Design an enzyme around this catalytic site. Structure first.
Site, PDB file in Angstrom:
ATOM      1  N   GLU A 256     -41.686   5.080  -1.843  1.00 62.85           N
ATOM      2  CA  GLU A 256     -42.157   4.362  -0.238  1.00 62.85           C
ATOM      3  C   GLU A 256     -42.412   4.961   0.363  1.00 62.85           C
ATOM      4  OE1 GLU A 256     -38.876   0.779  -2.339  1.00 62.85           O
ATOM      5  OE2 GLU A 256     -38.300   2.725  -2.826  1.00 62.85           O
TER       6      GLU A 256
ATOM      7  N   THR B 183     -50.399   2.953   1.132  1.00 63.19           N
ATOM      8  CA  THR B 183     -50.487   2.017   2.099  1.00 63.19           C
ATOM      9  C   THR B 183     -51.473   2.705   2.767  1.00 63.19           C
ATOM     10  OG1 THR B 183     -48.757   1.398   2.232  1.00 63.19           O
ATOM     11  CG2 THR B 183     -49.838   0.420   4.091  1.00 63.19           C
TER      12      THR B 183
ATOM     13  N   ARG C 135     -46.867  -4.699  -2.940  1.00 61.83           N
ATOM     14  CA  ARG C 135     -45.939  -3.031  -2.878  1.00 61.83           C
ATOM     15  C   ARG C 135     -46.072  -3.121  -4.627  1.00 61.83           C
ATOM     16  NH1 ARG C 135     -44.258   1.566  -3.836  1.00 61.83           N
ATOM     17  NH2 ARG C 135     -42.176   2.037  -4.809  1.00 61.83           N
TER      18      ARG C 135
ATOM     19  N   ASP D 279     -53.433  10.446  -3.772  1.00 61.78           N
ATOM     20  CA  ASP D 279     -52.264   9.859  -3.720  1.00 61.78           C
ATOM     21  C   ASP D 279     -51.553  10.573  -5.056  1.00 61.78           C
ATOM     22  OD1 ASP D 279     -50.691   8.261  -2.618  1.00 61.78           O
ATOM     23  OD2 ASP D 279     -51.400   5.944  -3.810  1.00 61.78           O
TER      24      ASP D 279
ATOM     25  N   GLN E 279     -41.318   9.356  -6.317  1.00 64.08           N
ATOM     26  CA  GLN E 279     -39.820  10.007  -7.460  1.00 64.08           C
ATOM     27  C   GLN E 279     -40.120  10.513  -8.036  1.00 64.08           C
ATOM     28  OE1 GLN E 279     -42.198   6.442  -8.014  1.00 64.08           O
ATOM     29  NE2 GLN E 279     -41.036   5.332  -5.950  1.00 64.08           N
TER      30      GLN E 279
HETATM   31  N1  LIG Z   1     -43.202  -3.108   7.527  1.00 60.41           N
HETATM   32  C1  LIG Z   1     -43.680  -1.451   6.723  1.00 60.41           C
HETATM   33  N2  LIG Z   1     -43.918  -1.312   6.025  1.00 60.41           N
HETATM   34  C2  LIG Z   1     -44.855  -0.692   5.863  1.00 60.41           C
HETATM   35  C3  LIG Z   1     -45.446   0.970   5.958  1.00 60.41           C
HETATM   36  N3  LIG Z   1     -45.686   1.692   5.305  1.00 60.41           N
HETATM   37  C4  LIG Z   1     -45.250   1.063   4.270  1.00 60.41           C
HETATM   38  N4  LIG Z   1     -44.721   0.048   4.187  1.00 60.41           N
HETATM   39  C5  LIG Z   1     -45.043  -1.169   2.789  1.00 60.41           C
HETATM   40  O1  LIG Z   1     -43.796   0.072   2.276  1.00 60.41           O
HETATM   41  C6  LIG Z   1     -43.858  -0.173   0.778  1.00 60.41           C
HETATM   42  C7  LIG Z   1     -44.734   1.007   0.219  1.00 60.41           C
HETATM   43  O2  LIG Z   1     -45.203   1.237   0.119  1.00 60.41           O
HETATM   44  P1  LIG Z   1     -46.287   2.260  -0.273  1.00 60.41           P
HETATM   45  O3  LIG Z   1     -47.199   2.426   0.378  1.00 60.41           O
HETATM   46  O4  LIG Z   1     -46.233   1.530  -1.831  1.00 60.41           O
HETATM   47  O5  LIG Z   1     -45.265   3.575  -1.121  1.00 60.41           O
HETATM   48  P2  LIG Z   1     -45.635   4.429  -1.836  1.00 60.41           P
HETATM   49  O6  LIG Z   1     -44.458   4.888  -2.823  1.00 60.41           O
HETATM   50  O7  LIG Z   1     -45.205   6.184  -0.658  1.00 60.41           O
HETATM   51  O8  LIG Z   1     -47.191   4.754  -1.868  1.00 60.41           O
HETATM   52  C8  LIG Z   1     -45.186  -1.222   0.786  1.00 60.41           C
HETATM   53  O9  LIG Z   1     -44.813  -2.806   0.501  1.00 60.41           O
HETATM   54  C9  LIG Z   1     -45.923  -1.347   2.073  1.00 60.41           C
HETATM   55  O10 LIG Z   1     -46.227  -1.793   1.995  1.00 60.41           O
HETATM   56  C10 LIG Z   1     -45.201   0.894   7.792  1.00 60.41           C
HETATM   57  O11 LIG Z   1     -45.471   1.546   8.481  1.00 60.41           O
HETATM   58  N5  LIG Z   1     -44.225  -0.758   8.218  1.00 60.41           N
HETATM   59  F1  ALF Z   2     -42.860   4.784  -4.523  1.00 54.38           F
HETATM   60 AL1  ALF Z   2     -44.513   5.836  -4.844  1.00 54.38          AL
HETATM   61  F2  ALF Z   2     -45.943   5.964  -5.459  1.00 54.38           F
HETATM   62  F3  ALF Z   2     -44.544   4.155  -5.399  1.00 54.38           F
HETATM   63  F4  ALF Z   2     -43.869   7.199  -4.461  1.00 54.38           F
HETATM   64 MG   LIG Z   3     -48.162   5.281  -4.086  1.00 57.06          MG
END
Ligand SMILES: Nc1nc2c(ncn2[C@@H]2O[C@H](COP(=O)(O)OP(=O)(O)O)[C@@H](O)[C@H]2O)c(=O)[nH]1
Ligand code: ALF
Ligand SMILES: [Mg+2]
Lengths: 193, 319
Positions: free
Chosen positions: B12, B17, B154, B176, B180
């Site tokens: 997360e 994103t 998400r 990407d 977890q």
């Molecule tokens: N407000 C806010 N929300 C964010 C930001 N970056 C990601 N999100 C939200 O955080 C949640 C997790 O992000 P995601 O990109 O799926 O995470 P990942 O698991 O690293 O791929 C999503 O609902 C995104 O929209 C940010 O800089 N600001």
């Molecule tokens: F939480 Al993730 F890609 F969905 F690290």
């Molecule tokens: Mg992801």
């Protein structure tokens, strides 16, 4: 408790027990190579390499190990030692004397190995946390997936794994990678690898 | 000859994103049809999100702002999150409309809100709030998720995903991955021919614990992952760039929660964004053992990412 918004998470054995103890890690060459890949990539290699070489010297006849005792000294204990490990000053000095009279150093040497154990155990502990972070495969743990507890089975995997360490051993200076290679193979070969 | 970029970071942190932003800024963007595909995900985020809230109100013994909302709470808990479509994070429009009245009532309930404010005690993404505050636009029959909606949706990532694009004749390949613990085993399969690593950190997770084991502080996990990466001699040749993402959420958070309550070392105004940001940078820089580039980002803001990526590109090309 309280439910999660994402219920489909799966965490994904007893390799855990082997990685926490040096004695058995040394009896499982394949696992040892993983740990060496960790050390060589993330930490000070001196302590472990010194310990392993000193181990071989312990299991060798007093009349067939003088040259190995000189190498150990020049690589790890000597003042300008490329892979200098820090051991108690008293210990340094007594091992220095013994060799300068051709006596039996194994005793103080064993004390030197014990003093280095402290840092090795810390490194063993640092690696266990890398495993907990799920970064095991970062250091070759994938080459363990599919290993039944067979002595011969494992020794074969020790090779190939070891045959691919040059990858890390290259990021080093010739003056450090050379002695490292010497040390690595000194123990591996004595382990039938 | 290709600029290969790996996106790493705990769960997360905002990797996907960022990926979507690359597509909006340098690629084909998202046409309406592509955006419609996020609708099921968005409706699912909201129903499952609200369900966590009522379950939290209850277990944390938070009072109802109004007892009559108990019946709406019952309707939501009866929703089977393990059924086929729900299992893969999707919800049909017709089904979403059946829960709308109840969801709108629950969101107005102060107990539900209180539970939301105490989300650090459980697991919940802050974008569920964004969609709950926009129930009106999600409820219309002809609803099409906006670009912003798409960025907020998400979708947990499992496995590896590639996205190719170009910037002035330079070919880019961005990878990407999931963050977890269980997904990090797949990180080693991409480190090949990698030119640069973008390490994302949710700068506002200092008061939260991991989903993996509801005990380890999130920022601690990020710090430790970063420490193993940056200190691995195998990566001495690779350009590591740090992204302190979710700047917007950190800004809001420092006004109601103090980082001092979680990290003693902090000595400064805990109400000051600038001081918390400095402290965080210090934490990551201090982990290198031997040029550490960093940026404060908001992955959901396209303009911010546009200017930030320009800096990244220049750094990588010159290194
Ligand atoms: N407000 C806010 N929300 C964010 C930001 N970056 C990601 N999100 C939200 O955080 C949640 C997790 O992000 P995601 O990109 O799926 O995470 P990942 O698991 O690293 O791929 C999503 O609902 C995104 O929209 C940010 O800089 N600001
Ligand atoms: F939480 Al993730 F890609 F969905 F690290
Ligand atoms: Mg992801």
């Amino acid at each position: 408790l309280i439910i999660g918004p994402e219920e489909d998470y799966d965490p994904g054995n007893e390799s855990d027990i082997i990685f926490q103890d040096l004695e058995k890690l040394k009896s499982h060459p394949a696992y040892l190579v993983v740990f060496l890949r960790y050390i060589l990539s993330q930490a000070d290699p001196g302590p472990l390499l010194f310990y392993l070489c000193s181990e071989v010297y312990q299991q060798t006849n007093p009349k067939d190990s003088r040259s190995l005792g000189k190498d150990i000294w020049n690589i790890f204990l000597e003042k300008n030692a490329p892979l200098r490990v820090k051991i108690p000053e008293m210990l340094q000095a007594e091992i220095d004397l013994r060799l300068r009279n051709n006596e039996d150093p194994r005793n103080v040497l064993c004390e030197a190995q014990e003093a280095v154990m402290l840092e090795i155990q810390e490194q063993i502990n640092d690696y266990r946390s890398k495993r907990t972070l799920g970064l095991g495969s970062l250091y070759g743990e994938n080459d363990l997936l599919g290993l039944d507890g067979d002595p011969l089975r494992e020794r074969q995997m020790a090779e190939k794994q070891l045959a691919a360490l040059g990858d890390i051993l290259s990021k080093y200076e010739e003056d450090r990678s050379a002695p490292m290679d010497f040390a690595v193979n000194t123990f591996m070969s004595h382990a039938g690898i | 000859r290709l600029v290969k970029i790996l996106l790493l970071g705990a769960g997360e942190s905002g990797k996907s994103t960022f990926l979507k932003q690359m597509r909006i800024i340098h690629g084909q963007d998202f046409d309406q049809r592509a955006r419609e595909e996020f609708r099921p995900t968005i409706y699912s985020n909201v129903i499952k999100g609200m369900r966590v809230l009522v379950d939290a109100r209850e277990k944390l013994h938070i009072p109802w702002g109004d007892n009559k909302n108990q019946l709406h709470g019952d309707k939501l808990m009866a929703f089977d999150t393990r059924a086929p479509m729900a299992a893969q994070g999707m919800v049909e429009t017709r089904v979403f409309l059946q829960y709308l009245p109840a969801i709108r009532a629950l969101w107005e309930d102060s107990g539900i809100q209180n539970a939301y404010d105490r989300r650090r005690e459980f697991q919940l993404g802050e974008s569920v709030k964004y969609f709950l505050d926009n129930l009106d636009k999600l409820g219309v029959p002809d609803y099409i998720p906006s670009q912003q909606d798409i960025l907020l949706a998400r979708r947990p990532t499992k496995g590896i995903h590639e996205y190719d694009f170009e910037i002035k004749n330079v070919p880019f390949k961005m990878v990407d991955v999931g963050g977890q613990r269980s997904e990090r085993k797949r990180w080693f399969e991409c480190f090949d021919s990698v030119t640069s690593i973008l390490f994302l950190v949710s700068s506002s997770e200092f008061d939260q614990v991991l989903m993996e084991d509801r005990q380890t502080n999130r920022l601690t996990e990020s710090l430790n992952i970063f420490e193993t990466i940056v200190n691995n001699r195998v990566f001495s040749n690779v350009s590591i760039i740090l992204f302190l993402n979710k700047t917007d959420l950190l800004e809001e958070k420092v006004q109601v929660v103090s980082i001092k309550d979680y990290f003693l070392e902090f000595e400064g105004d805990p109400h000051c964004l600038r001081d918390v940001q400095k402290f965080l940078v210090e934490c990551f820089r201090g982990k290198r053992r031997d040029p550490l580039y960093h940026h404060f980002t908001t992955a959901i803001n396209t303009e911010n990412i546009r200017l930030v990526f320009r800096d990244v590109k220049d750094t990588i090309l010159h290194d």
